[PDB]
Design a protein around this nucleic acid. Structure first.
Lengths: 392, 223, 134
RNA sequence: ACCUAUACAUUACCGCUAAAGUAGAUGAUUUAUAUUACUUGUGAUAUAAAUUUUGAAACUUUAGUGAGUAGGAAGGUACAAU
RNA sequence: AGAUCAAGGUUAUGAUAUAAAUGUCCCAGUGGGCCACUUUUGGUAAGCAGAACUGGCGCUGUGGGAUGAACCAAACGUAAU
RNA sequence: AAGUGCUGAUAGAUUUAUAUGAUUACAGUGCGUUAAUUUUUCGGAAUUAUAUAAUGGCAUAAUUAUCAUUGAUUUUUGUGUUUAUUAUAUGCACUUGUAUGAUUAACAAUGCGAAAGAUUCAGGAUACCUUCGGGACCCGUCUUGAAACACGGACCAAGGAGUCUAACAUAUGUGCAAGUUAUUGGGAUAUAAACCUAAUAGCGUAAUUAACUUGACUAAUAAUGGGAUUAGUUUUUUAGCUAUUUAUAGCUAAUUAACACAAUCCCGGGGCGUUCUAUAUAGUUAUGUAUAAUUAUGCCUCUAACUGG
RNA sequence: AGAGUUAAACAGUACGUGAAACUGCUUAGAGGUUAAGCCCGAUGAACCUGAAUAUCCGUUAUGGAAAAUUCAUCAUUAAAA
């Protein structure tokens, strides 16, 4: 929508120089969508074109003359070698199970080694790489020591293209605080763990920055022998440089006249491009893309219904036939029938211990007459019934 | 302005929980006095019809209790289907069944894998109190209180208490179909003391088919 | 463009600091601004200026120099470098944790940051102790 | 009476399957207390202390459930290279 | 035989719903079967030959029948009771 | 059938409930009317009215409906009646109290992670040896069925078998969209890469005939036009629900109307083909014809074109 | 067999590593049953792994020292956010 949105990119020069009067505007590729899923899928494929053929000799296997010395000779049935006298006899020819014999399907030259990616999909893989070469969260997650740099995307003046001796390049990469990255590329010069070490790849290190110049006055020769850094020209812009491995966001350095051309290559949000015929910058599926302000939000939290705030687990089934406390929770009336028959069974044992007052007549001291003495005070309920129940 | 709202919720959820407990007391009191006037009437009718020398038949039984008794293999595709529809798919599962001509001819079909009989009130109670579970969107929720019957069945039937389940099942009510399909089938366990043959009829050996009063005495040792 | 959720789903798995270790289901970032060192979404190098951490010291033992986030004066397109500010409390082993709650109020890392400065101040101490047993 | 299965049952654990919940943390929540509007009474404000990220590809809750050749699908795992 | 109006009560046996409905890949394998109740044909009979139904074995362990592909119980995540 | 009144034993006891959500509703204890009654006297003890619909009991009215009907059973109740029964009328504090958050915790004993130094208690079929009990046939394969008196295998290390390609088809990912696709080439050029790019060319955009013919809805508009079954957005009024200023929302629907996506199910309509049929045809436009001079205009129409169901 | 050489001869011409198959010797325990192996429960011997500090009816009552302070009721001042 915008093309502006952070619309002032300061330019720096050789003495780390914040101050110009030249402040150019952010060239609107940098809002276009970062998509590492398409960048990885263009990278997977496009670097299959620097790739030449391996293939085994198509006569390996088959210049014996072995016929299957065939059943019934107590020995199995492979083609065995004919001769006698050379001790390669009979000895097993032609099969992949055999020593000497031809491999399962031998590798040919007309395997598809190279590939064609669609050319908009290259441009919508370069665009996501350029757009992620700003955004220093995604440079810093390639390693890339960038916490000395003073801007993103870092733009140096055009004068650095005239530099000519490499001593005056590590003077330059010192002053812009990016020497500490190419000092990290010195740290990881190692040896490979292959088979590389026999086959002429005895290592890389990691990558470093990428000086995107516009006109090599002497720049490319001046930055050759620094290990880690590599430069590029704005017209070319290889993707396999700007996202090494499928992984967006190499630490990049624009010069001034490099940076001022990106509003032509991939044109702008307003108009198409002039240097790429008919190209039109890709539109994201989600323009605002900040969820924590989308969910914040007061345009949405006047709709939301149910923030169910308990958990409600609390589960265990008790037993309402041994745990009495569940009976009175579940069938509350059944509490009554407990206090009715157990009260009525109380007076039964009261009556049957008074059957011993038929027999031995002992007490009745503080134990069982006191169980029945309350009836005499309970007589007053019937004695009030003759005087207080005659009020209505 | 939230704390004003919740403590009016919290004190109207209290008054409704209080107005269930008394309304589930005097409703269990009314339901209990039915089961005293009922069985005392059938004493009164016999001690009547003896002196008038008539024969008092009692009522034929509605409400069976049907329990799969035997085995999940070697079963034929028409006893395989009746016993699916009776929800009896394991050994020693039991469901409540309303008896008419239309399920009795289905208990006839599934007869050698089923023992059944007509249950006591004590048997109806002890099966939903000790073993009794409940369907909350296919989940088998236990009982744990009588909110969990008040939830799904008070708004569209008038069952809210646990004794309203027992009343809708002992007296086979209009909401019977709702309150047997509410209860997940009773996963009883194996009777202590045992079975007798499991695969000769109750009149010959003792299991499958109508026990018809002795589902109560079996369920004593099964629940 | 730039938001901590778009930035994170690019970084969620293909990171350079995330270094998951072998059984433990996907955690550990070795970031310089993590302070509860897993990889969450909001314990992270750049989550865009909720980026607090707790570093010692430089002078052990007294300090914990705290890199406080260098915030919304920055995009954080870089700064004529600012964006780590390093206000470092000192001099009292359990007063400064009140002076860190007192300092910041960015209530998402807050109890997981003074949970870390304690666990630095637990660690830098033990020089004149763990000695004699005579 | 009693003994006896990998069956039945109640529990712990593993998976599966099916549902359900959580993301305003310059927020939420406690405990006290100062003040307070005061509505009797309960809230709102200040103070002091306290708890409050999760590869949201996560975490939390709940229930059922588990035979398998030929065979198919998912998720891991060993080897070597870019 | 239809196209729009008017009237219609409480939706019209029972019990069930481990979700059902539908495309594509007609994708893999298979296209030698054997056993058994009851029915049955050829044969004198057969652990023979050939069919109808249901269930099994094949693919399936465990308990029982001393023993066993199919019998009788029972179907199988690791454990206690 | 009731708890009737218990007494014995057994095994078991998830839980980082904020390592992103009640420990609170319950009930239970300890302070603040009354009065006699009783009992022990050291407590307790008992007592009414205190407000119910009253539910059960009695009498009676009343009606729904019935086994059998002298009657009984009810049903709706209603009144009176007293006999009982039950619930509600316990705030404020305060407990180490009970419950409920898959209800295990209180008491003791034993023993010190013990500076290096070093014991106690539990556990360890790790991978074996010793001692017993139980179970226990040899794998791979074909087969209806293998421990098979079926085939291969004495043993061990290395090797060893579902691949590249071509062309389709479906599914999924991605880019652009009536389009798309550099890649045969060319250009720039940093190097068999990447970039840029003119004319085509494929495939799609329109089909059907053996072929020649012909070539897609009444219309400046229309998703199988129309019809059903439609998810969903708008909309209707109604009580109505939370908030209400009683404004404005959310809710069910009752229910009005509208468009009805997708998908399937029915009925059409067009293109082309084939066939019947209308034309008896008049007639529709021009050559011709009428004239002037291919030309101008008349108009009949021998001629071709054209209309029709 | 001593000695010597080397960093090393456990690198001495099978000359780097030096696996399995199979085995001479030492040590340990044991031996008449499925031929041996093996599963599961335990076992003797042997070796081994793990083990704990702020409370009942509280991170409460209360006295000693040390050091020191953007802390106070502190106050100004200087910043950087």
């Amino acid at each position: 929508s915008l093309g502006n949105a952070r619309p002032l990119v300061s330019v720096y020069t050789e003495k780390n120089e914040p101050a110009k009067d030249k402040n150019i505007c952010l060239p609107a590729v940098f809002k276009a969508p970062i998509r590492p899923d398409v960048v990885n899928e263009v990278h997977q494929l496009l670097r299959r074109n620097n790739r030449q053929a391996y293939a085994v000799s198509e006569l390996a296997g088959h210049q014996t003359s072995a016929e299957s010395w065939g059943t019934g000779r107590a020995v199995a049935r492979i083609p065995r070698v004919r001769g006698g006298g050379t001790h390669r006899s009979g000895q097993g020819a032609f099969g992949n199970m055999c020593r000497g014999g031809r491999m399962f399907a031998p590798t040919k030259t007309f395997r598809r080694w190279h590939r064609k990616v669609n050319v908009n999909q290259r441009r919508y893989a370069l665009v996501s790489a350029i757009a992620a070469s700003g955004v220093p969260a995604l440079v810093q997650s390639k390693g890339h020591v960038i916490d000395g740099v003073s801007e993103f995307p870092l733009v140096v003046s055009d004068e650095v293209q005239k530099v000519q001796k490499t001593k005056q390049a590590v003077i330059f990469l010192r002053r812009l605080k990016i020497w500490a990255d190419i000092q990290k590329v010195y740290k990881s010069q190692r040896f490979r763990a292959g088979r590389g070490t026999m086959r002429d790849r005895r290592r890389i290190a990691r990558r470093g920055p990428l000086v995107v110049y516009d006109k090599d006055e002497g720049l490319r020769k001046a930055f050759r022998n620094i290990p880690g850094i590599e430069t590029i020209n704005v017209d070319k812009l290889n993707l396999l440089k700007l996202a090494p491995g499928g992984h967006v966001g190499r630490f990049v350095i624009w010069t001034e006249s490099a940076f001022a051309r990106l509003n032509d290559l991939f044109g702008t949000w307003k108009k198409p491009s002039t240097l790429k015929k008919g190209y039109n910058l890709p539109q994201p599926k989600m323009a605002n893309t900040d969820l924590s302000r989308l969910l914040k939000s007061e345009e949405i939290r006047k709709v939301l219904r149910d923030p169910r705030k308990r958990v409600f687990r609390s589960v265990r089934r008790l037993n309402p036939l041994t745990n009495v406390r569940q009976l009175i929770k579940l069938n509350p009336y059944a509490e009554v029938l407990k206090r009715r028959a157990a009260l009525a069974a109380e007076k039964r044992t009261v009556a049957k211990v008074l059957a011993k007052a038929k027999k031995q007549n002992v007490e009745l001291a503080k134990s069982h007459f006191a169980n029945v003495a309350t009836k005499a005070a309970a007589n007053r309920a019937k004695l009030l019934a003759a005087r207080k129940k005659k009020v209505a | 302005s939230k704390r004003v709202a919740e403590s009016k919720r919290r004190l109207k959820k209290a008054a409704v929980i209080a107005l269930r407990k008394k309304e589930n007391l005097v409703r269990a009191e009314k339901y209990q006095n039915e089961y005293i006037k009922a069985e005392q009437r059938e004493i009164k009718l016999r001690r009547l019809a003896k002196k008038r020398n008539q024969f008092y038949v009692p009522a034929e039984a509605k409400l069976a209790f049907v329990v799969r008794i035997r085995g999940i293999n070697k079963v034929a595709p028409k006893v395989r289907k009746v016993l699916q529809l009776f929800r009896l798919r394991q050994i020693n599962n039991g469901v409540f069944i309303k008896l008419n001509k239309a399920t009795i001819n289905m208990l006839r079909i599934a007869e050698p894998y089923i023992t059944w009989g007509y249950p006591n009130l004590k048997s109806v109670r002890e099966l939903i109190y000790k073993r009794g579970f409940v369907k909350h969107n296919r989940q088998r929720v236990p009982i744990t209180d009588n909110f969990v019957i008040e939830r799904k069945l008070r708004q569209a039937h008038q069952i809210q208490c646990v004794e309203d389940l027992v009343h809708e099942i002992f007296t086979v009510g209009p909401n019977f179909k709702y309150a047997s399909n509410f209860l997940w089938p009773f996963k009883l366990n194996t009777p202590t003391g045992g079975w007798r043959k499991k695969a000769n009829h109750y009149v010959n050996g003792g299991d499958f088919g109508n026990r018809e009063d002795q589902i109560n005495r079996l369920l004593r040792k099964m629940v | 463009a730039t938001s901590s959720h778009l930035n994170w789903l690019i970084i969620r798995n293909n990171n350079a600091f995330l270094l998951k270790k072998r059984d433990v289901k996907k955690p550990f970032s070795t970031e310089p601004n993590n302070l509860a060192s897993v990889s969450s979404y909001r314990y992270s190098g750049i989550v865009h200026k909720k980026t607090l951490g707790v570093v010692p010291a430089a002078d052990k033992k007294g300090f914990t120099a705290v890199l406080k986030k260098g915030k919304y004066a920055q995009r954080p397109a870089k700064n004529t470098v600012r964006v780590d500010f390093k206000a470092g409390p000192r001099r009292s082993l359990k007063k400064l944790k009140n002076l860190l709650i007192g300092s910041k109020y960015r209530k998402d890392l807050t109890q997981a940051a003074l949970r870390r400065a304690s666990a630095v101040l637990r660690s830098q101490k033990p020089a004149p102790v763990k000695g004699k047993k005579a």
